[PDB]
Amino acid sequence: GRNRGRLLCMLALTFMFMVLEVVVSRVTSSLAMLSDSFHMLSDVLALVVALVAERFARRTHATQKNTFGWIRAEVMGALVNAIFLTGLCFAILLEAIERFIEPHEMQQPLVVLGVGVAGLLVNVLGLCLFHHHSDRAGQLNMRGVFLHVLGDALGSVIVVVNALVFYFSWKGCSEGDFCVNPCFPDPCKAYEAGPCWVLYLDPTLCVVMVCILLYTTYPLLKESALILLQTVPKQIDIRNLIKELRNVEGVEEVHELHVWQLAGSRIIATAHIKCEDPTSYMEVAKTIKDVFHNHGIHATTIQPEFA
């Protein structure tokens, strides 16, 4: 509900910001702005993934297909967001090392500053919106869009700082009067420009950006891929679980024990406990049920393989 409205307003803000970029590019006569807009378009994919995930979360119904109900949509959306972000991070690192080998010059720092502060305020507003998720499946999914919004805001920060760096240290004697640049490899050749060391600042800070993005994304992907692999949660303990279950009176062993986490706090477990008398079984059944209860798990299915 409220998270749905948050996603909707954030997506609307992204599209309005794209419209703003194309409108300011109409005035600047620049194709690089079109490139930046088309590359920032990639947030719409993650936003619509989170949207459809939240839409399918409210299914919680047993059907003729997927008799559990579409409860794992949240986890699937989180995993999709994590993998997509890692791929985008790889691509950004590739472009960064390319530009680091070839230091392309900067263009239009004032309007880049304007649009960068615009994106700064917008992305900080979006981050303040997505900070209550830094039951559980909701935060599990929203962590992906939080990571993407953090990447957005950090790109805004880095581009604004680079803009001011050029503004404050690049006299850039390159056009109009007698003006060349010694640090450019080949400016379409057949005084020298200002201090050129700032040229590599964009890649040498984009590398830090992608570093922090990987370092912060890895936990979300780890948790999600662990949940989807049918692994035991961190809370319960098999070693003492089976020991207590055996120590229960009436039981003699356990053939097969299975525990996993469906989507969230509700986890399921099955067993093959064995008794000796069929006359009294419901008492030991209630006993095993309350053992599981006191040990976390509440969705139980135990089969008395008699003798």
Ligand X SMILES: COC(=O)[C@]12CCC(C)(C)C[C@H]1[C@@H]1C(=O)C=C3[C@@]4(C)C=C(C#N)C(=O)C(C)(C)[C@@H]4CC[C@@]3(C)[C@]1(C)CC2
What spatial distance separates the first Cα and last Cα of the chain, rounded to whole Å?
Answer: 53
H or E element in which residue 261 lies? strand 258-261
Taking CB under 6 A as the criterion, which residues in 59-78 touch ligand X?
none
By DSSP bridging, strand 299-302 and strand 267-271 are parallel
Q: Which of 14, 25, 156, 181 binds ligand X (CB under 6 A)?
A: 156
Q: Cα separations (Å) of 239 from 79, 244, 246?
A: 30, 9, 11
**In this structure, are residues 276 and 261 in contact, taking their beta carbons and an 8 Å threshold?**
no
H or E element in which residue 240 lies? helix 238-247
Residues touching ligand X, count (CB under 6 A): 17
Backbone angles phi, psi at 205, to 5 degrees: -105, -25
Using rule CB under 8 A, residue 29 touches its own copies: no
Q: How far apart are CA 76 and CA 85, in angstroms?
A: 14
Using rule CB under 6 A, residue 39 touches ligand X: yes
Question: Closest separation between CB of residue 97 and its own copies, Å?
Answer: 7
| 92, HSE (Cβ side, Cα atoms, 13 Å) | 25
Taking CB under 8 A as the criterion, which residues in 259-298 touch its own copies?
259-260, 262, 270-272, 278-279, 281-282
Question: Closest separation between CB of residue 230 and its own copies, Å?
Answer: 5
Tell me which of its own copies, ligand X, none is bound by residue 68, counting a contact when its beta carbon lies within the kind-specific cut-off of 5 to 8 angstroms: its own copies
Q: Which residue is nearest to ligand X (CB)?
A: 155
Q: How far apart are CA 153 and CA 162, in angstroms?
A: 14
Q: How far apart are CA 281 and CA 86, in angstroms?
A: 53
Q: Which stretch binds ligand X (CB under 6 A): 150-158, 212-220, 249-257, 296-304?
A: 150-158
Q: Which of 6, 59, 99, 136 binds ligand X (CB under 6 A)?
A: 99
By DSSP bridging, strand 258-261 and strand 267-271 are antiparallel
Contact residues: its own copies, CB under 8 A: 31, 34-35, 38-39, 42, 45, 64-68, 70, 72-73, 76, 79-80, 83-84, 87-88, 90-91, 94, 97-98, 101-102, 188, 225, 228-232, 238-239, 257-260, 262, 270-272, 278-279, 281-282, 301-304, 306
Contact residues: ligand X, CB under 6 A: 36, 39-40, 42-43, 88, 92, 95, 99, 119, 151-152, 155-156, 159, 202, 206
